[PDB]
């Protein structure tokens, strides 16, 4: 149906065609770039880049800020907030900002959306119309998992490190090098890392085990827990688990894995005094009535979004959508 | 009114009279022991001991299990569960187990209670009738903060290390030594530790700043965050903050400090499908109606207990207290 490019953790990548690899660097890297070369096929050119900074002590790097360039508009996503810099006094704003669950969903009219958790990871969804016309770190959308190493010169190179380094934006950035083993570097956290990441092989994800192989995700969890030693390994572990959770949710079946002792969420914080409407939905609501989305309309386009969601009462069931409450009606 | 002996974090102690110090060891240590020596004043003798294990890599130790001895009854508190070993087929069971908020409150008829968070810390409350007749790691209850160093031989010694080592249970245990500086040992976590523990000096605890000095608690938070490097520093930071939170709550005023990004609780997990009764009370309910506590009775003896609490509807407002729901009536 729709392909997905997933970037999460400490340089873990997943191409549109299904190829997976690992690469770490400290520079600006372009994930998806439209209109490769000078060929402009009467379409707008969109460019998304990520900023990586060295997090930890072994040498691993994680994404910190994401910049979006399209139609002369520049958007910045840092510290969990959206800041617009590039402003054009013409045409029409093509991006819409939505807050569904724990993700920061943005939508564009061209057919490209983003799923940002505001911490480390980012999910990219592309329409099938852009097949065979997109190049970048996510690989060419050609449904072939063996030719996803175009090093910006239309030349497939098996060197993953060279392929990653060939996509650097600033020429002055230092060249990336091969990483070490975080578990070997810090052998006093291996037992804790294994005990925490053993939940992937537990009976909770029995349904996911029959569709998605968890070996790669388990190894990623172990590596992240061994490397996330700069303070806040709980967030790294939660993101590593949520990556596989969203991957399994994309298939179509949802599984509840959260636990008050394992990555908890405070859904009651948004509830006002004397009221209770917010609830936790592991599978995410299909469609809800908001100010911009009337009751008669229901856009079932995105699936697999977990987080706190409100349950408006029958009286005043329209979500006001700007100050987190349900209202009778809005203009 | 009532004195309190608090043990939390990595060997942080607070005597009944108000003296505070720090000591780390790896053995069984007696906190409060009744009837010091051979003097039996026609009262039952209670003895509470704690088990410390080396947690981390610098050399700090934290409590893991707590054993209670009274009336020939032995109780064990490990892995967040209560296990009874010492059983006597005579007299009557003098202990009651209650689950209020996040603490595991146990009550005894003699006048001694315990507040266990099931993770690291333990709070002891003693009746004023036991003044000047209790010796142990909590010091003699004599309202004097300068003679709280009785090293089991009725001799006050200024050496905190010697005073702590003189209370070891097993003679074969190794003698404790002076600890090092965790922040100096791991200088790559100082910035993160300071950024996390700066919440104590923020405007949230402005009311607490006028009653309890937060310098000692801030130093304890910094040291714990620098030392808790074995995996799970979030739990260590949460316990360090909750210690000062409970200390301020004991004064009489309550302040809400929890945040969905700072030590969250999943109060919605206990809510059944289609119902919403559980809520988070920073100050704790004064009294609630349960199966063993009718509506006409309200025991207002303990204050300062935060956590998830249920709000039963007017219909069937009696808490069933054994399977987490509200029922109309129970025998
Ligand atoms: Ca390809
Ligand atoms: Ca004393």
Author numbering:
A (entry chain A), B (entry chain B): 899 to 1229
Quote the study on this structure.
The two gel-forming mucins MUC5AC and MUC5B constitute the main structural components of the mucus protecting the underlying epithelia in the respiratory system. We determined the cryoEM structures of the wild type D3 assembly of the human MUC5AC mucin and the structural single nucleotide polymorphisms (SNP) variants Arg996Gln and Arg1201Trp that affect intermolecular interactions. The D3 assembly forms covalent dimers that can appear in two alternative conformations, open and closed, where the closed conformation dimers interact through an arginine-rich loop in the TIL3 domain to form tetramers.
The structure of the MUC5AC-D3 assembly was analyzed by cryoEM at pH 7.4. The cryoEM reconstruction of the D’-D3-CysD1 recombinant protein reached higher resolution (3.2 Å) than the isolated D3, even if only the D3 assembly is visible due to flexibility of the D’ and CysD1 domains. The covalent MUC5AC-D3 assembly dimer is formed via two intermolecular disulfide bonds, Cys1132-Cys1132 in the C8-3 domain and Cys1174-Cys1174 in the TIL3 domain. These were estimated to represent 17% of the total MUC5AC particles. Interestingly no major structural differences were observed compared to the low pH.
